[PDB]
């Protein structure tokens, strides 16, 4: 939470994109924000920048 | 209270609060209007009429120690004597009312 890093459990299939909504680092991201892009097997990702 | 009647134009003189009062009531277009004078000296001219707010507005006029006048509801010259009234309040209770206003 302090560093803003989140981990996805299962491997992500190719061509799948996700968004996150809320407030991070004091910045509002109520609209969906692109933060992860499915490369095929990686399950570790990080937040985007509002 | 102040006795009145149902007439479009009237004026009454009365002695209350140890001072001489004279009030003129008359219709102007839609709203009612009043003219108030004390001790043979005019006070204010052409005040509009409304329910619950005092007639004397500006600070110096209404009292150092004197009283003031308030209508319960909006006036209508066809309702006086029946359900619409005028009341006089002297210093202490008028100050209490003014404090309650805010």
């Amino acid at each position: 939470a302090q560093t803003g890093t989140v981990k996805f459990t299962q491997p992500l299939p190719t061509g799948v994109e996700a968004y996150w909504t809320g407030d991070w680092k004091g910045g509002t991201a109520a609209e969906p924000a692109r933060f992860a892009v499915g490369n095929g097997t990686q399950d570790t990702f990080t937040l985007s920048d509002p | 209270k102040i006795p009145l009647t149902a007439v479009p134009n009237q004026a009454i003189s009365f002695n209350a609060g140890s001072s001489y009062w004279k009030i003129r009531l008359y219709q102007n277009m839609d709203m009612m209007n009043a003219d108030i004078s004390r001790d043979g000296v005019i006070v204010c001219h052409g005040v509009r009429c409304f329910g619950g707010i005092p007639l004397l507005q500006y600070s110096h006029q209404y009292r150092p120690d004197y009283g003031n006048f308030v209508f319960d509801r909006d006036a209508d010259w066809t309702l006086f004597g029946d359900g619409i009234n005028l009341f006089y309040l002297d210093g202490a209770e008028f100050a209490e009312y003014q404090a309650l206003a805010t």
Partner: protein, 417 residues
Amino acid sequence: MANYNYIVDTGVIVADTADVLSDVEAEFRAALGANINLAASTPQGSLVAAEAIARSSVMRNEARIANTINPNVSFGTFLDAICALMGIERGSDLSTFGYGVQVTGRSQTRISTGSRVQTPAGAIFTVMSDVTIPAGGVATIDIKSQEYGNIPLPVGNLIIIDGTIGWSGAKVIASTRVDPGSRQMSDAELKNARVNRLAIQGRNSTMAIKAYVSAVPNVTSVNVIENNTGAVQVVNGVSFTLPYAVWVCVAGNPDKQAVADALWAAHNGGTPWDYGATNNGVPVDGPNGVPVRDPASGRKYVVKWTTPIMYDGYVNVTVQQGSSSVAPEAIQNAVVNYAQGKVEGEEGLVVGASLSAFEVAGAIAREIPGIYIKLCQVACVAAGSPAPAPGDFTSEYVMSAFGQATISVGNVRVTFV
């Protein structure tokens, strides 16, 4: 020549129609001759009447708008006067509907502006005409008579104006419901809004906080103080150079977010909120009380507050019965209800309030006179500690600012010597 200066320092003068009529008559008599005829039928009399009506009308109209800055006025000018600060108008709408339910015959048209009624006898009219398919179901659009924020009861309707073979005005929850405004603010609630806003702006920094927090439900007492210095004034506030210090008590705080919302309403724009040197009352949370962002188009903000340290006190009472019967539990009830403060004239054991046996004896005396009191002593200790020894009692227990005391029925012990 015949002009009257009806605009004076005192105000504006409205005369009677007879006077202006006579003045105009004199004007025309001087204009043509002293021996003219002024009656309605002759043209000059018509000129007299036109002039008199014009003068009286214009003069009255000017007298109508003699003063407007005063909040007494109304009808548009006052509407913008209030809108300059804050205020809405119009608000005269009617709840137009959609997705009506109608079962009827086959291949027929429902005529527009039909009548509909529902159980408390509200009048509703349809909007657009439509045909009916052989199945027996169509969607309608409704409207009412008045410009009022009416509410439709989810009940089967009844028909007032009847077409042929067309019945069963029926409910459906799929129908859209649009909340209508109904001239919500005519002339006087605008004045009340003015009063409320001027009351809001009047208060200073601290008294506004006290008033706002006192308004929340289930709250009991509040303590507020400003250090205004980097030293110790009443409590050890040297946390920052110039904090603002808050302490709030409550009977449970049913709404954790509401007390933050009330606090968030009052911020002076140049002062933080944290206070204390790890000695004052325990804050609810370390970093923040997680407030709401903003009800009206805003972002995340933070605010801080703390609650006092709960305490429990012990009181010893010695009494001689005298010559009557008094329930000791009744006396204990009197003392306890004094402690909360439901007797008029005494606030009670609010935050930062010491207690003395003298005040307890006074409460007993006011509750019941004509009785003898021998001795009463008091003591107080932190919550959860075992019962103290009789040597721990005293006449009065001084309490710190950030503490709060509570007394229970079983805690007090009485002696009917």
